[PDB]
Swiss-Prot record, chain A:
Part of the 50S ribosomal subunit. Forms a cluster with proteins L14 and L19. In pull-down experiments interacts with CedA. GO terms for molecular function: rRNA binding; structural constituent of ribosome. The keyword Ribosomal protein applies. Transmembrane segments: none annotated. The modification N6-succinyllysine is found at K38. It comes from the Bacteria. GO terms for cellular component: cytoplasm; cytosol; cytosolic large ribosomal subunit. Belongs to the universal ribosomal protein uL3 family. It comes from Escherichia coli (strain K12). This is Large ribosomal subunit protein uL3.
Curated annotation (Swiss-Prot), chain B:
The keyword Lipoprotein does not apply. Pfam families: Ribosomal_L14 (PF00238). GO terms for biological process: cytoplasmic translation. NCBIfam families: rplN_bact. This is Large ribosomal subunit protein uL14. InterPro entries: Ribosomal_uL14, Ribosomal_uL14_bac-type, Ribosomal_uL14_CS, Ribosomal_uL14_sf. Belongs to the universal ribosomal protein uL14 family. Gene3D superfamilies: Ribosomal protein L14. The keyword Magnesium does not apply.
Curated annotation (Swiss-Prot), chain D:
This is Large ribosomal subunit protein uL6. GO terms for molecular function: large ribosomal subunit rRNA binding; structural constituent of ribosome. The keyword GTP-binding does not apply. This protein binds directly to at least 2 domains of the 23S ribosomal RNA, thus is important in its secondary structure. It is located near the subunit interface in the base of the L7/L12 stalk, and near the tRNA binding site of the peptidyltransferase center. Gentamicin-resistant mutations in this protein affect translation fidelity. GO terms for biological process: cytoplasmic translation; response to antibiotic; ribosomal large subunit assembly. It comes from Escherichia coli (strain K12). Belongs to the universal ribosomal protein uL6 family. Keywords: Acetylation, Antibiotic resistance, Ribonucleoprotein, Ribosomal protein, RNA-binding, rRNA-binding. Part of the 50S ribosomal subunit. The modification N6-acetyllysine is found at K43. InterPro entries: Ribosomal_uL6-like, Ribosomal_uL6-like_a/b-dom_sf, Ribosomal_uL6_a/b-dom, Ribosomal_uL6_bac-type, Ribosomal_uL6_CS. The lineage of its organism: Bacteria, Pseudomonadati, Pseudomonadota, Gammaproteobacteria, Enterobacterales.
RNA sequence: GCUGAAAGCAUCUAAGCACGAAACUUGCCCCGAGAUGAGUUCUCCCUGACCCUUUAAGGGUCCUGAAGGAACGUUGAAGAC
RNA sequence: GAUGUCGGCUCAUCACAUCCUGGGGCUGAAGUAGGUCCCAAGGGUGAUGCUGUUCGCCAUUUAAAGUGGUACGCGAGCUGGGUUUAGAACGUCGUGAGACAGUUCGGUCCCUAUCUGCCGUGGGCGCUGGAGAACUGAGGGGGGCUGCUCCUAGUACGAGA
RNA sequence: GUGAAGAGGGAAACAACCCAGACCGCCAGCUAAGGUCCCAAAGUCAUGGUUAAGUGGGAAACGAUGUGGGAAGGCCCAGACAGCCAGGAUGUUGGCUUAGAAGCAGCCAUCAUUUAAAGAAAGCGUAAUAGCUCACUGGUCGAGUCGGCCUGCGCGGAAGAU
């Protein structure tokens, strides 16, 4: 089934009557407006392309403005696609809101993880550190050996070493839906989801069943 | 968190006063023992005319840690020290007859009901 | 199954059959004699 | 060889039709069709079928013999068909046919339900035996086989599904 | 294992048909059209003159400067740059 | 006209002659548990005492604590305990200087990375008028482990345990 | 003999192996060893046969109704081989440690005899003679069948590390 695009409002808890604290991530999902519909005949696959939010008209470029004009929808802050199952069809300009998840009870959330920057091998790959004392000289957090002797004579593809960590697309699967609140445009899911506060999230019904 | 080389006070009248964790049971590379968990200990000190001697190796169940336990609502219970109850090595039943100090509800697990019954608090 | 380089008839009821390129001995009398070349 | 060189005689009321290599048999128990392999030719002589090898094919005689046996079993099937009887031995082992599905209880902690194929019909004369009737010999043999496969006869009491006629040849544990 | 000859019997195989494992191909997650085999879809923008010559080509002058972009500035839960 | 040598640390990678987990045949396989052989390399595969030790022996775990190759993998990555410089001593050998694969205490480990390789991140041009987006997915990569308890059921099996 | 002190062509690459000894030039021809489907020059050449593993293109003792070819030999149209509807007139409880093991613990006796032929035994159940197939040769069915020798090509034996 299709999903929606939301925004990570933040994190809080829900207190249940039996005395259990549920850590919840709050995703504000406004109406998602179908901007395009793609089918086998024209595009070779079935999908619906939606937008959400709003953006100031003074920097919607003319190509984007023209694209939104065909659908007759208000310009949003981005565009995202969702593959269609065999059953559902949507129409251009249709508005999809949060009660899609009224009875889903398990969602996957995709976001862009917080960017850690150029991280070393210890933080990036859980490398053991070397001795802090006992004669160790200038090698406390360094990666150690990176290969064998002459026989390979080369470092293998995919070797774990320092580099950029974070700021990449991450999906967390099978998150419980604590509640769906239609009038406030809110989804409360149990647990933590990728990304900093105020970033875009893609919520889909759980595929892992 | 109790790990190997940790010294625990003893919370029953088994004769021991100080024990040392020499293994955390139940899993390869297992690191820590919480409050419901069974460890293996050696006895570092015991009272003279007692039941168990200094040096014997046997099991124990942790009952209080000052790492503490978390309750489902987020609350924690922290003690002032680490304590265990000695169990015999084969049929893991308590060796002593009295339990000193409080315990927690993490023990109410049909296996340490004796410790629950004997404990002053919980 | 006896996997061995020299398979032989052991009784009268045991029989030699080439199944899928490999020589086998299948014996109706008892399964102790069932053999394969390998 | 000798098998192929013995013609199969079609009885009255059974119909055959040879489309090049495909043979189709009409009978009172229904339809059986089969494509022969290229190395065998078959002639409808007077109320009989004759099997011979094509020319230019090695091992044509073996194929002819296989085809002859297949067609003989085919015509035997379209009349009266074939039947296979299975027994269940062991305490609490039961069978029950419901529609085209066999319900078995071979001492599992789950129910076992076998779907029959198109041409096979089952019926249980009593609680602990099954009788399969069908037209095609291969399919009914296959069904009996994978019905037995659920719990094959173990060698200390014979417990499990057995063919009604097969011997088990049980043994005994050690002494002491 | 089923049916089945070669080898009138047997036979899981030669023709044909079934099952069968954390291995294999998928299914799950990420990168991915420099996939030079450089793909597709949607949207937007630009429809003025003239000269020259070694021309089937090109060069140059005037007028024009779009959609966009970049640069600059205030910056960021993005970042060595 | 120099290829640094034992063990540890860090980081690995492949083979399969498989330690566990998966699938099977035979059993002198009642059950539980085993023995042996065949298929299988996806993942997993202890932290301590003694010793420089690899090993080993012990103490406790674990589903298991695999066997090998990789310059006995890895010192332009670390250590420097062993070992083979110079000091000193013991036993022993030698008249002696000195010596011992005997022991004993002490004893400098350099390198700012050009190229290949690898981890990240950009610039140029291309893709055939230019531009802004959203994708398809040829290909790559990641992940792939498992215990215990309960029910089925104290049932099947066993004479009983 | 060659390399050293010899280049050229082949052997993928490869001093020392195979062919062959470079005075210089040619956008001429014939050959050697090796080759002739494409990389890559030349036969998708001709005739006859073999092999089915990618054997060819790694590896033995040994194992096997893989097939191709010989030289001989039995069993047989008086009926062979296989399969079947084919089973049986020992004095017999005829000698064992025994108030039947005379065949199935271990020996002799194997003497009288039956058929058209059949049997003091090879098993199994039962240590147990009480039940199965026995090497029976009676019948049906009616053309090949059973082993051994020499030999060509194949099959398994056959597990390693970027």
């Amino acid at each position: 089934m299709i999903g929606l695009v939301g925004k990570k409002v933040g994190m809080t808890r829900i207190f249940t009557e039996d005395g259990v604290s549920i850590p919840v991530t709050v995703i504000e999902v406004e109406a998602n407006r179908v901007t395009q519909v793609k089918d086998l005949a024209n595009d070779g696959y079935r999908a619906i392309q939606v937008t959400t939010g709003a953006k100031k008209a003074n920097r919607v470029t003319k190509p984007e403005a023209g694209h939104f004009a065909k659908a007759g929808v208000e310009a949003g802050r981005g565009l995202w696609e969702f593959r269609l199952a065999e059953g559902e069809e949507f129409t251009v300009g249709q508005s999809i809101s949060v009660e899609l998840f009224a009875d889903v009870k398990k969602v996957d959330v995709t976001g862009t993880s917080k960017g850690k920057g150029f991280a070393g091998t210890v933080k990036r790959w859980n490398f053991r550190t070397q001795d802090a004392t006992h004669g160790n000289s200038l090698s406390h957090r360094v990666p150690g050996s990176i290969g064998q002797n002459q026989t390979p004579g080369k470092v293998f593809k995919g070797k774990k070493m320092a580099g950029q960590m974070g700021n990449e697309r991450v999906t967390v699967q099978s998150l419980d839906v604590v509640r769906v609140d239609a009038e406030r445009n809110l989804l409360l899911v149990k647990g933590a989801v990728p990304g900093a506060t105020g970033s875009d999230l893609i919520v889909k019904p759980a595929v892992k069943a | 968190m109790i790990q190997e080389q940790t010294m625990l006070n003893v919370a029953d009248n088994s004769g021991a006063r100080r024990v040392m964790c020499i293994k955390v049971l139940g899993g390869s590379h297992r690191r820590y023992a919480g409050v419901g968990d069974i460890i293996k200990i050696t006895i570092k000190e015991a009272i003279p005319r007692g039941k168990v001697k200094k040096g014997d190796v046997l099991k124990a169940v942790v009952v209080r840690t000052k790492k503490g336990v978390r309750r489902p609502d987020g609350s924690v219970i922290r003690f002032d020290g680490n304590a265990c109850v000695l169990l015999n090595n084969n049929s893991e039943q308590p060796i002593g007859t009295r339990i000193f100090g409080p315990v927690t509800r993490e023990l109410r697990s049909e296996k340490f009901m004796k410790i629950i019954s004997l404990a002053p608090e919980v | 199954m006896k996997v061995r380089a020299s398979v032989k008839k052991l009784c009268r009821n045991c029989k030699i059959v080439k199944r899928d390129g490999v020589i086998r001995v299948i014996c109706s009398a008892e399964p102790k004699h069932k053999q394969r070349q390998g | 060889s000798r098998v192929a060189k013995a013609p199969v005689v079609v009885p009255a009321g059974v119909d055959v039709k040879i489309n090049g290599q495909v043979i189709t048999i009409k009978g009172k128990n229904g339809e059986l069709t089969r494509t022969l392999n290229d190395a065998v030719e078959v002639k409808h002589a007077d109320n009989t079928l004759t099997f011979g090898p094509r020319d230019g094919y090695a091992d044509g005689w073996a194929q002819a013999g296989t085809a002859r046996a297949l067609l003989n079993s085919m015509v035997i099937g379209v009349t009266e068909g074939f039947t296979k009887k299975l027994q269940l031995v062991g305490v609490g082992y039961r069978a029950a046919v419901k529609g085209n599905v066999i319900n078995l209880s071979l001492g599992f902690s789950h129910p076992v339900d076998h779907q029959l194929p198109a041409g096979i019909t089952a019926e249980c004369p009593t609680q602990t035996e099954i009788v399969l009737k069908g037209a095609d010999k291969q399919v009914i043999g296959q069904v009996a086989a994978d019905l037995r496969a659920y719990r094959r006869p173990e060698p200390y009491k014979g417990k499990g599904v057995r063919y009604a006629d097969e011997v088990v040849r049980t043994k005994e544990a050690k002494k002491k």
